Amino acid sequence: APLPELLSNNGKHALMVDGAPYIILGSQTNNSSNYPDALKDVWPSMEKMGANTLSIPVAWEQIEPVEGQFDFSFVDVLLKEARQRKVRLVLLWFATWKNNAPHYAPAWVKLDNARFPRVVKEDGDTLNSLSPLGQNTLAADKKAFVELMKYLAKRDKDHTVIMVQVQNEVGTYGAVRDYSPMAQAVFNAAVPDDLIQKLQLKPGTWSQVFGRDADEFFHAYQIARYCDEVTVAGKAIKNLPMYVNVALRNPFNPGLPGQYSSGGGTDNVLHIWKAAAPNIDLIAPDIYFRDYKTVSKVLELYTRPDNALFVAEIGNDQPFARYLFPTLGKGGIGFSPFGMDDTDYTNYPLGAKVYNDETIEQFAQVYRLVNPMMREWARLSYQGQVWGVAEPLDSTTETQKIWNAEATPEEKEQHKKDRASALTQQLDLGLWDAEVTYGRPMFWVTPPEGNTPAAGGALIAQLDDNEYLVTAYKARVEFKPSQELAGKKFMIERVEEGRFEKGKWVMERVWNGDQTDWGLNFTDRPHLLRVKMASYSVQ
Amino acid sequence: APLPELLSNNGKHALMVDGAPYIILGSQTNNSSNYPDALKDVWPSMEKMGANTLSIPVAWEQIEPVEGQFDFSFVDVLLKEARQRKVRLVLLWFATWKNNAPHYAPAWVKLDNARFPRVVKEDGDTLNSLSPLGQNTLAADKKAFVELMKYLAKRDKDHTVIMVQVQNEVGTYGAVRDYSPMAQAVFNAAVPDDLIQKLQLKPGTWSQVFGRDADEFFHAYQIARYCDEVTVAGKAIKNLPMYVNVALRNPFNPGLPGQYSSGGGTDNVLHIWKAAAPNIDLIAPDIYFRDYKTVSKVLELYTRPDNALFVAEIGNDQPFARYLFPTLGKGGIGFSPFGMDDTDYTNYPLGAKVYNDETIEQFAQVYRLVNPMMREWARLSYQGQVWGVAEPLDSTTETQKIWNAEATPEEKEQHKKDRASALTQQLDLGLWDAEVTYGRPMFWVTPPEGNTPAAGGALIAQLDDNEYLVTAYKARVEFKPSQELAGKKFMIERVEEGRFEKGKWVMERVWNGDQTDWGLNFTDRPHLLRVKMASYSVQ
Ligand SMILES: OC[C@H]1NC[C@H](O)[C@@H](O)[C@H]1O
Ligand SMILES: OC[C@H]1NC[C@H](O)[C@@H](O)[C@H]1O
Ligand code: NA
């Protein structure tokens, strides 16, 4: 089988797996599930979820517990169990940084500051975050990572592991950069030529060329170089796609670097990361903002002609499930909810308060829409035109439920009109437009009021000028001409519900009558439709 | 087996099936269930309901997807599966009109307006409703319908299919008639002689003879002729009963034609339809009005010496179930709730908000009263005297629950009296009268307060001068002399609960004592009674 690879062309991207585009319908374990005994608490969630790919840590501490004495017993069990369950793997290399810190590095690393130095604050105090200028640290991380890749090269010939995450949420909390003498010497020196060339800047020292951004851009650059070197060394052994994941700053109201994780691939340093680390395939957002506007903004910032969108982590509470739709609609290669196992942990308030079948089912229900067409969607999402939307009002707050209750009948009617309008999305599909609305009956035209809780969305792919592939969830999708018809009329020509078998469309039934009079109405159950529109002459 | 046929005699009617009267205890699928793959979501509901007859579409688009290339693969599967389940079929020919529009006509029909022309408004705009004056449209519909009938002639010798509906809810929304030049020419001309003779009118042009009703009567007449020609051609192949179903106007407050579907068999044009389409066996109301008075009025309007009553569609929400009783009481030949399948659709607000076992059970419970005596009831309903009533107050409406709560103890007592009186119905059964009351204990005489929700009803057939067949549901039925007795007394002589086996009555037990002291009290469980009354001398 050909190696997995990330392709980028015409500003679009595909994760190739076994020689064709692939979508990661993912799940990630909790942080302490990377042991053989924990896997029995992982697989059942994955099965219930319908996930095709598991993201799970492989820790430097577990593979090199004593320097030079490697142990791949976990990776062995993991590969074998994944294959038995017919799922793929993304391994998360928890090493120099996990959430800014070295807790997953071996004891002989994290307890030897002299050999493996920490970031020093401007005031001289030390933080528990390893400096990217530590050359011994880099050499050691690199050597262990290379051994892991050698294990895969020798023992995973069919590429059960399809991607590797290098480190986990790199950066530093509590300072902007390393201010140690070692780091200060490099900061005071000239900005490297390659970076100056790539950003088309005037040469100089860090402070000269970057000014108020020098400290942060420096930390970002040095971390990016470190991760790039690890990535290169591993890829020289087996050239799997590799990526880094970002502890995000709020894109609207970030606060200061150091409050957020300074030096990671935050939106303001993506240009530094892309220049510094050309061997890292993509930079992936970790999404735990619950609210639609902020999530939408993150998706927009991380989807670029030079950056495939991969939602490497997202919260596992109910409101997050619907963000699958815009993720895929942006041409995303994957989506991976965090903490999908029964090892007695919840990261509430980030995720679900309780982990149970209902938690899982919120994601299972949206995965069921994509699984039946995964390869076909993946191809259209690289080579063609796709769209995806989610229900754009968050669930109504208690504060808003009180403001609603004390309103004035004229204010209530007006608020309902405003909500209806906000819950109506328009998409330009070329000759045809779609309108997506949320939370209304399947019959007649009473205006949308939203689902409770917010949960809906829709996917659309263009198959031809007048033909679209459509599936949606707790929503209505309606089609109309994109531009005025010169005395013509229009209608739905045909809607077929069906499936793909061996890449061929098989029709199950035609939607007509009630099922197409009031748009195309979807509940929680999966239906995949091919919709053919027609304008026709009446002259 | 003899062909099914609709008999009419002495102002009464019977649907003959296999040589004897038959009652359709029906169910109708949702509009997009007319495919082999959907049938697995249809049969279980039918079984749970206890229905004996399934109404399901056969679409022109599916049988003639390319002109001249016929495909009966769906009809084949459907016939075979129906027979395996030992049920009968009513096929619904979705063709030139389905709900006023051509969406179920093939693409080569509906997208070719030049060949198959649409209704043109008085202002020159075109509506998506095919004109009944289109001669190509008629020929093409007729040809396909004839092929369907040929399929049944050759492949359904035992008449699994017992009746065919020609079109579905014909007419036009948004205009009263076709105002195209083609139509305007026929409108300006003389009203056809046969119509002038049949309605005993003075000859003239449409506007002269009909005045303010000309536009609507013209559309009705032209549609009726079209449907009659299709019907005749099909019957020449196999002479099954055939009917049309009506998108009803509100009989008390109709609004204007075009707001309602103009040209269909609405109550104000039944005379036009009966004169124009003598080959169509009956005109069937589609009932979605929820309230007792309006439903009752519809049943009254559509039950005529020249029109067998068939409730071809009724809403599937709980309040509609009880209308089975007055339907059968009027000598109706059948009753068919709409949307009885699990294909992920509800026509709420017309039907039930959620489709589940409870939805089905509301109809199952009333069908269980009739199924055990279906052939016996059908014969009595043609040859004899039958009666049927439903609970005449709709379920109490929130607004009324508030008005009741803020009343004055004298106003509450008075309201309760008024309700009790409204919930008491009197029936003249010849020598004996019955009084039916709803929502009271099975013992003693506390006045009726109604069921919650409204749900009760009763069926009575006369077996002899003093003997009646009775079954009822969430109601009390009491008998008394119809005439003052000349110094005689009366009593129940005997009440037997039982069943029919090979057309013979088999007694299970005698109701007496508590069971007959306070009338005949019925809950949700089925009991079929023979009630013999007696007057006796005490002189
Ligand atoms: O549960 C919080 C979550 N935050 C993001 C990190 O990448 C994850 O490992 C985890 O710590
Ligand atoms: O669900 C509404 C119902 N209205 C009446 C039509 O005859 C049916 O086919 C269906 O459209
Ligand atoms: Na456009």
Residue numbers in the entry:
A (entry chain H), B (entry chain C): 37 to 575
Give the exact sentences the study uses for this entry.
Genome walking in silico revealed the presence of open reading frames encoding a predicted β-galactosidase from glycoside hydrolase (GH) family 35 (CjBgl35A, encoded by locus tag CJA_2707, bgl35A), a predicted TonB-dependent receptor (TBDR, encoded by CJA_2709), and a predicted α-l-fucosidase from glycoside hydrolase family 95 (CjAfc95A, encoded by CJA_2710, afc95A) upstream from the gene encoding the known α-xylosidase CjXyl31A (CJA_2706, xyl31A). The data indicate that CjBgl35A acts strictly as an exo-galactosidase that requires terminal galactosyl moieties on XyGOs. Rather, the specificity of CjBgl35A is similar to plant β-galactosidases with a general ability to remove side-chain galactosyl units from xyloglucan polysaccharides; the GH35 member from A. thaliana, Bgal10 (At5g63810) produces XXLG and XXXG sequentially due to a preference for the underlined side-chain in XLLG (Sampedro et al., 2012 and references therein). The liberated XyGOs are then imported into the periplasm via the TBDR, where the exo-glycosidases CjXyl31A, CjBgl35A, and CjAfc95A work in concert, together with a currently unidentified β-glucosidase(s), to yield monosaccharides for further catabolism.
In the complex structure, DGJ is located within a deep cavity, approximately at the centre of the proposed active-site cleft. The Kd for this interaction in solution was determined to be 485 ± 42 nM by ITC. DGJ is co-ordinated in this −1 subsite by a complex hydrogen-bonding network mediated by the side-chain groups of residues N67 (interacting with O3), K134 (O3 and O4), N135 (O4), N204 (O2), and N383 (O6). The side-chains of E205 and E349 occupy classical positions expected for the catalytic pair, comprising a proton donor-acceptor and nucleophile consistent with the retaining mechanism expected for all GH35 members. Furthermore, the position of the catalytic proton donor-acceptor residue is consistent with an anti-protonation trajectory. A pocket positioned directly adjacent to the pseudoanomeric position of DGJ is proposed to be the +1 catalytic subsite that is responsible for binding side-chain xylosyl moieties present on XyG/XyGOs. Curiously, the apparent solvent-exposed nature of the non-reducing end of the ligand suggests the possibility to accommodate extended substrates, since the axial 4-OH position of the six-membered ring points directly out into the large cleft. However, in fucosylated XyGOs such as XXFG and XLFG, the pendant fucosyl residue is α(1→2)-linked to the galactosyl residue. Steric considerations therefore explain the requirement for CjAfc95A to first remove the terminal Fuc from such XyGOs before the underlying Gal can be addressed by CjBgl35A. As highlighted above, steric limitations of the CjBgl35A active-site also indicate that CjAfc95A must remove terminal fucosyl residues prior to fully enable degalactosylation by CjBgl35A.
